[PDB]
């Protein structure tokens, strides 16, 4: 399991570590950005193994590490988003808005 | 055998229409319950049997004519959703 924690220091290294590939290809860290990244990448370790997968990664943490839930609720404890307790609060929050879309025009290739 | 002939259970043909008429003779038959008389005399109805059989009859027949009147009731709400989505 990753910890806050492990994610924070993967983040540091992965900014220090960006830096560190601008300063070895030559361009400025500031506007250095994912695409250089990926082109620097594939430049220093070339890799034709047809799996893009297989192929050296030099990601964001984010992107790399999986996902986590969203606190709900703050420290008062008094959730956040009024249709909170449906347990679906998202969905039924969206069809509430498309309800009222509707209710307004009554009154009133792609897949 | 006492009785005027050709008036109790007489069909007219009209225009030639021999099956129509069989076929409403048959009808006539059947709605004055002359063909389930004339059937069921065929052999003898214990009177147990047949009391039991009159009470099951009668009591199918209201259970039926509740459940009708209860479907028809409940047909109203049957209709298109009015507050779809919510």
Same mark, same amino acid.
């Given at each position: 399991?990753?910890? @806050? %924690?492990?994610?924070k220091?993967?983040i ?10 601008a300063?070895?290809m030559?361009e %400025?860290? @500031? ?19 047809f ?5 050296? *990664? ?10 986590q839930r969203?606190?709900?609720?703050? @420290? ?21 808005? *498309?309800?009222?879309?509707?209710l ?8 | ?12 043909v009209?225009? /030639? ?11 006539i038959?059947?709605?004055? /319950? ?6 069921? !005399?065929?052999?003898?109805?214990? &009177? $147990?049997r !047949?009391?039991? !059989?009159?009470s099951?009859?009668?009591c199918? !027949?209201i ?18 959703d &009015?507050?779809q /989505? $919510?």
């Amino acid at each position: 399991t990753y910890t @806050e %924690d492990f994610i924070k220091k993967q983040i540091e290294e992965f900014n220090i570590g960006k830096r560190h590939l601008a300063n070895m290809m030559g361009e %400025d860290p @500031e506007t250095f950005t994912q695409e250089d990244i990926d082109r620097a990448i594939a430049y220093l370790f070339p890799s034709g193994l047809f799996e893009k997968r297989a192929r050296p *990664v030099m990601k964001h943490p984010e992107q790399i590490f999986p996902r986590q839930r969203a606190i709900q609720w703050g @420290e008062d404890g008094r959730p956040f988003h009024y249709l909170f307790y449906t347990g679906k609060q998202s969905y039924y929050s969206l069809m509430h808005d *498309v309800y009222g879309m509707l209710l307004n025009l009554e009154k009133h290739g792609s897949r | 055998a006492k009785h005027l002939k050709f008036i109790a259970r007489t069909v007219m043909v009209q225009e /030639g229409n021999v099956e129509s008429a069989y076929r409403t003779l048959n009808r006539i038959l059947t709605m004055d /319950g002359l063909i389930e008389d004339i059937k069921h !005399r065929r052999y003898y109805e214990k &009177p $147990c049997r !047949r009391r039991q !059989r009159e009470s099951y009859e009668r009591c199918r !027949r209201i259970y039926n004519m509740e459940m009708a009147r209860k479907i028809n009731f409940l047909m109203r709400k049957n209709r298109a959703d &009015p507050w779809q /989505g $919510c």
